[PDB]
Design a protein around this ligand. Structure first.
Ligand SMILES: CO[C@@H]1[C@@H](C)O[C@@H](OC[C@@]23C[C@@H]4[C@H](C)CC[C@H]4[C@@]4(C=O)C[C@@H]2C=C(C(C)C)[C@@]34C(=O)O)[C@@H](O)[C@@]12OC(=O)[C@H](CCCCCCCC(=O)O)O2
Ligand SMILES: Nc1nc2c(ncn2[C@@H]2O[C@H](COP(=O)(O)OP(=O)(O)O)[C@@H](O)[C@H]2O)c(=O)[nH]1
Length: 822
C-alpha cells in the first residue's frame, strides 16, 4: 500500500520500472500466477470503478542482486506494471496494440503439454513488438503427483520445452536485439506450480549454495543445468554421463535441485511421519504453530511455499532480466514511430526523455462507472503529461499537413490505473503507464497524444472506413414511411460514414463501417432520426431473366381475334454488347449514323440490323432488342407502336418471375396481320406480342442472372488464408493476389455473389482476427447454369422463393400456355 506521493516517486526512477504482461495459452495458469504475484507484490492506495486493465507490483531487491542487473539501475525498489491482454487471442491487431505498451513478457508453459500452438502464436506476436521474454514451466506439481515422473525424466521434459521455445525465438526475434533466447542456467527460466504457490530458478539455488560454502555462483549455476555431473566418490565435476568405470552419474540439476523436491513429496504424500521433521531440518524449512499437524497435500502446500515462494522466483526474473523503459525504448523507438528516426520526437522516445514534447500512446479506452465515460489508457513514451495540460489528440488517420480532424483539448485529469480503481495524479514522466480522463469523445480505441506540431503518429491500428455491412430497413406501420424517409436523411447528415440508398428492388438500404457501427446507426435511426418501429432485414437481391441460346422453334401466337399471328424467335445478345447498351455507348438517343457505325464497325453486327431494330427494352434503352426481320408483310408498320409497347412490358418483367430481361434479342421473323385497322389496334396486338415474346423467351433455354460484387481486401500475408476459407463457403472466386514489396499487406480481389454476401464482412473478420480490411462494389451480372424452371436447382430455388414472396403461383407457366398452334 502506497500514497500518491510514494507512487509518484517510484515513477521518477524509470530505470527501475518494468512494463510487462503474462503471455500464456489457455488454462496454462496465467490467472493463478498473476494472482500469486498480486498477493505478494500488489500495490494499493492508502466511487469510480473501472474495468481492470493493469496492476502495479512493488518489489525490493538486495544491494547485491541489484548488481546482477545488466542495465542502468537506481535504488533497490522496482515498480512493475502487469498489463493485461486476455481477449480474443486470434485478433492479432487487438492484441498487438495492447502488447505494444509492454517491454517484457513472462511466457508461461505447461510442463505436460509443453509448448503448443496458442503458445507460440502469442510468443511470436510479442517478439513482433521487440519484447523480451522469460519463461516459467508451470504445473510442475501435475507432473509429479500424477505422472509419477522421475528426476531425469522431468529434466528431459524441461530441456525439451526450453529448446522448443528458443526455436521460436531465434527463428523470429530481430537481430537488432542480440541473442534473446532463454537459458535456465542464466536464470531466465523458472519452474514451479502456480497453484501450490512455489517456483524456483537455477539462480536461486546456485546463489544459496554459493554462500553456504564460499564458491562463485556464475560458475555454479552453469553446472546446475545441462550435462554437468558431480561424482560423490571422486568429489569432482565431470562433463560425462558416465564415470571412469563407465558407471552412471547423476546430473547436477537432478542431484541438487530436483532430488530435494522429489524427496519432500514422497516423505509427505506417503505420510512418512519420522522423515518429514528431519528432511525439513536439513532444508531449514521452519513451520509455525498448527502447521506441524498437517498431513499430505495440506502439508506439502505449506512446506513448498515456505521452501520456494513462487513470487520471489518470478519477481527475480522480472527485475533482473526484463528491460526497463529506458533499456527498451532505445531499440523499440524505430518501430513505434511512423515518422523519421532522426525526428525530434522519435529521438525523445529513444531517450525516454521527460523534458521533451509529449509522445503518449493511447492503447485503448476503458469503461468506467463515471457515467458512460471512458478513460484513455496507455504509455508516456516522451515528455510528461500533466493534469490540465493541453494536448494534440492525433487520431489513427492524422498527418501533420492536414487539419485532418485533429483535436486540441485539455486533459481533465491524469490518473493511476490501479486495477479497478483510479487515483488522481498531477503529472507522469516518460516510461510510465497511465490513464487519462477527458478524451472520451475525441478518440476511440488507439490514438496518439503529442505536444509537438512535427510530431507524427505512433504505430496504431488502422481503420475500416468503407461501407462493409448493410441491411434493408422498412417501417412496421405503412403510415410512418415519411418519418423513415426523413430519418434516413437525418441519419446521413449526422454521420459522414453511413450510407443509405434505394435498392433496385425498392428497399431502403443502410450500410455501415462494421457491425457495431451499423448496430448503433439502426438504434439511432429507429429511436431518434425516424422514431418509428422499424423492420431490419437481409436486403432482397435483384435478378435478370435471360436466354442461353435461340428459340428451339419459332414462337407462334395468335391475337384474341385469331385473325393476327406473330412468328418470332429469341436469341442471346453478347455481354460486351449488353454492357455497351447499358453504359450508353450503344444509345437509342444517338443519331442513326452514330448508332449504325458503332454496332457495325466496333461490335461486329450485320450492317443491316441497325436499321431494323425497333426498340430497346425495358424503359426504352435497356439491353434488349426487337429486330424486324419480316418481309412481304403489308401493314407491318401500323402495329409498330403496339409491338414496341408490348416489348417495353415483357422486358420490365420477364415470365420466369417478373424480373427484368437482360441480353435478350427478339427477331420478328414474320407477321400475318388483318386488312382493316378495326381488328389490329392496340388491344389486339400488345397481347399477341407480349405473349409471343414470353413464348420465344421460354423456348430459348431461359436462365437467370445474379448480381455479383467485386471485393477488394487488404490483409497481412498470414491472415490471407482466412480470406480464402470464407470465400470458398460462399461461391466466391479469387481474381488476384498481389504482393506489396515490403509485406505491409497483400491485397486480394475476388468476385462474391451478392446473394452469398449477407454477414460476409463479419465472417471475414472472424476468420482473420479482424486483420482483413474489405470494401466491395457491384461489378457484374452472371448467368446461373442451373434450370430456373426446376424448383430443385439453385436457380429454381431462387425463383420459387421469389414467386412465393410475391404471392404468385409457385409453378412457372411453361412456354405452351403462351404458344398458339394451328
Ligand atoms: C457506393 O455504394 C454502393 C451502393 C450505392 O450500391 C451497392 O450495390 C447495390 C446493388 C447495385 C446493383 C445495380 C443497381 C444492379 C443490380 C443491383 C443490386 C441488386 O441485387 C446488386 C447490388 C446489391 C444490391 C442490393 C441487395 C442492396 C443492388 C441494388 O439493389 O441496388 C454497392 O455498389 C455500394 O458500394 C459500396 O461500397 C457499398 C457496399 C455495401 C456492401 C455490403 C456488403 C454486405 C456484407 C455483409 O452484410 O456482411 O454499396
Ligand atoms: N495442478 C495444477 N493446476 C493448476 C495450476 N495452475 C493453474 N491450475 C488449474 O488450471 C486451470 C486453469 O488455470 P488458470 O490460471 O485459470 O488458467 P489461464 O486460463 O491460463 O489463466 C484451473 O483449473 C486452475 O486451478 C498448477 O500449477 N497446478
Amino acid at each position: 500500500a502506497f500514497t500518491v506521493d510514494q507512487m509518484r516517486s517510484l515513477m521518477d526512477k524509470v530505470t527501475n520500472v518494468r512494463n510487462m504482461s503474462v503471455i500464456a495459452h489457455v488454462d496454462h495458469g496465467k490467472s493463478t500466477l498473476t494472482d500469486s504475484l498480486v498477493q505478494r507484490a500488489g500495490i494499493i492506495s492508502a466511487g469510480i470503478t473501472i474495468k481492470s486493465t493493469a496492476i502495479s507490483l512493488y518489489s525490493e531487491m538486495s544491494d547485491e542482486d541489484v548488481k546482477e542487473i545488466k542495465q542502468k539501475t537506481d535504488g533497490n525498489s522496482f515498480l512493475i506494471n502487469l498489463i493485461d491482454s486476455p481477449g480474443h487471442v486470434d485478433f492479432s491487431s487487438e492484441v498487438t496494440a495492447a502488447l505494444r505498451v509492454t517491454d517484457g513478457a513472462l511466457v508461461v508453459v505447461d510442463t505436460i503439454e509443453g509448448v503448443c500452438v496458442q503458445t507460440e502464436t502469442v510468443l511470436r506476436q510479442a517478439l513482433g513488438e521487440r519484447i523480451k521474454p522469460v519463461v516459467v514451466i508451470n504445473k510442475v506439481d501435475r507432473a509429479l503427483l500424477e505422472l509419477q515422473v522421475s528426476k531425469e525424466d522431468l529434466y528431459q521434459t524441461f530441456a525439451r520445452t526450453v529448446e522448443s521455445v528458443n526455436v521460436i525465438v531465434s527463428t523470429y526475434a530481430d537481430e537488432v536485439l542480440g541473442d534473446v533466447q532463454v537459458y535456465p542456467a542464466r536464470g531466465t527460466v523458472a519452474f514451479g506450480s502456480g497453484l501450490h504457490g512455489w517456483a524456483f530458478t537455477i539462480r536461486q539455488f546456485a546463489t544459496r549454495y554459493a554462500k553456504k560454502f564460499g564458491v562463485d555462483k556464475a560458475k555454479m549455476m552453469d553446472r546446475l543445468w545441462g550435462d554437468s555431473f558431480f561424482n560423490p566418490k571422486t568429489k569432482k565435476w565431470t562433463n560425462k554421463d558416465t564415470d571412469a568405470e563407465g558407471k552412471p552419474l547423476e546430473r547436477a540439476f537432478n542431484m541438487f535441485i530436483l532430488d530435494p523436491i522429489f524427496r519432500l513429496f514422497t516423505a509427505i504424500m506417503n505420510f512418512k511421519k519420522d522423515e518429514i521433521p528431519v528432511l525439513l531440518e536439513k532444508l531449514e524449512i521452519v513451520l509455525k504453530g498448527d502447521e506441524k499437524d498437517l498431513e499430505g497435500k495440506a502439508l506439502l502446500k505449506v512446506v513448498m511455499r515456505k521452501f520456494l515462494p513462487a513470487a520471489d522466483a518470478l519477481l527475480e526474473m522480472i527485475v533482473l532480466h526484463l528491460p526497463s523503459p529506458v533499456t527498451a525504448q532505445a531499440y523499440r523507438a524505430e518501430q513505434l514511430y511512423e515518422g523519421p528516426a532522426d525526428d525530434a520526437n522519435c529521438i525523445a522516445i529513444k531517450n525516454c526523455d521527460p523534458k521533451a514534447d509529449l509522445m503518449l500512446y493511447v492503447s485503448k479506452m476503458v469503461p468506467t462507472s463515471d457515467k458512460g465515460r471512458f478513460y484513455a489508457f496507455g504509455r508516456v513514451f516522451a515528455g510528461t503529461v500533466k493534469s490540465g495540460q493541453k494536448v494534440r489528440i492525433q487520431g489513427p488517420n492524422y498527418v501533420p499537413g492536414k487539419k485532418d480532424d485533429l483535436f486540441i483539448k485539455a486533459i481533465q485529469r491524469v490518473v493511476l490505473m490501479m486495477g479497478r480503481f483510479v487515483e488522481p495524479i498531477d503529472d507522469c514522466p516518460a516510461g510510465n503507464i497511465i490513464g487519462l480522463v477527458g478524451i472520451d469523445q475525441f478518440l476511440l480505441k488507439t490514438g496518439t497524444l503529442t505536444t509537438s506540431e512535427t510530431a507524427h503518429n505512433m504505430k496504431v491500428m488502422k481503420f475500416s472506413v468503407s461501407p462493409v455491412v448493410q441491411v434493408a430497413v422498412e417501417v412496421k406501420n405503412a403510415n410512418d414511411l415519411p418519418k423513415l424517409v426523413e430519418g434516413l436523411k437525418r441519419l446521413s447528415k449526422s454521420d459522414p460514414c453511413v450510407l443509405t440508398y434505394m435498392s433496385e428492388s425498392g428497399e431502403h438500404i443502410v450500410a455501415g463501417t462494421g457491425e457495431l457501427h451499423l448496430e448503433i446507426c439502426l438504434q439511432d435511426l429507429e429511436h431518434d432520426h425516424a422514431g418509428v418501429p422499424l423492420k431490419i432485414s437481409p436486403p432482397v437481391v435483384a435478378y435478370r431473366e435471360t436466354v442461353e441460346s435461340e428459340s428451339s422453334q419459332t414462337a407462334l401466337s395468335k391475337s384474341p381475334n385469331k385473325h393476327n399471328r406473330i412468328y418470332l424467335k429469341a436469341e442471346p445478345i453478347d455481354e460486351e454488347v449488353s454492357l455497351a447498351i447499358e453504359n450508353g455507348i450503344i444509345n437509342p438517343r444517338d443519331d442513326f449514323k452514330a448508332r449504325a457505325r458503332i454496332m457495325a464497325d466496333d461490335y461486329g453486327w450485320d450492317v443491316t440490323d441497325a436499321r431494323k431494330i425497333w426498340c430497346f427494352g425495358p424503359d426504352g434503352n435497356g439491353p434488349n432488342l426487337v429486330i424486324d426481320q419480316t418481309k412481304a408483310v403489308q401493314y407491318l408498320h401500323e402495329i409498330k407502336d403496339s409491338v414496341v409497347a408490348a416489348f417495353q412490358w415483357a422486358t420490365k418483367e420477364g415470365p420466369i418471375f417478373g424480373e427484368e430481361m437482360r441480353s435478350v434479342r427478339v427477331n420478328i421473323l414474320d407477321v400475318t396481320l388483318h386488312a382493316d385497322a378495326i381488328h389490329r389496334g392496340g388491344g389486339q396486338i400488345i397481347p399477341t406480342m407480349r405473349r409471343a415474346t414470353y413464348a420465344g423467351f421460354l423456348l430459348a433455354d431461359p436462365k437467370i442472372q445474379e448480381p455479383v460484387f467485386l471485393v477488394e481486401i487488404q490483409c497481412p500475408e498470414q491472415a490471407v488464408g482466412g480470406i480464402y476459407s470464407v470465400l470458398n463457403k460462399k461461391r466466391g472466386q479469387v481474381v488476384s493476389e498481389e504482393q506489396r514489396p515490403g509485406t505491409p499487406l497483400f491485397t486480394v480481389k475476388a468476385y462474391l455473389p451478392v446473394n452469398e454476401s449477407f454477414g460476409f464482412t463479419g465472417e471475414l473478420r472472424q476468420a482473420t482476427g479482424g486483420q482483413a480490411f474489405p470494401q466491395m462494389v457491384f461489378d457484374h451480372w452472371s448467368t446461373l447454369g442451373s434450370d430456373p424452371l426446376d424448383p430443385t436447382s439453385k436457380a429454381g430455388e431462387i425463383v420459387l422463393a421469389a414467386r412465393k414472396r410475391h404471392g404468385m403461383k409457385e409453378e412457372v407457366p411453361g412456354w405452351q400456355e403462351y404458344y398458339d398452334k394451328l
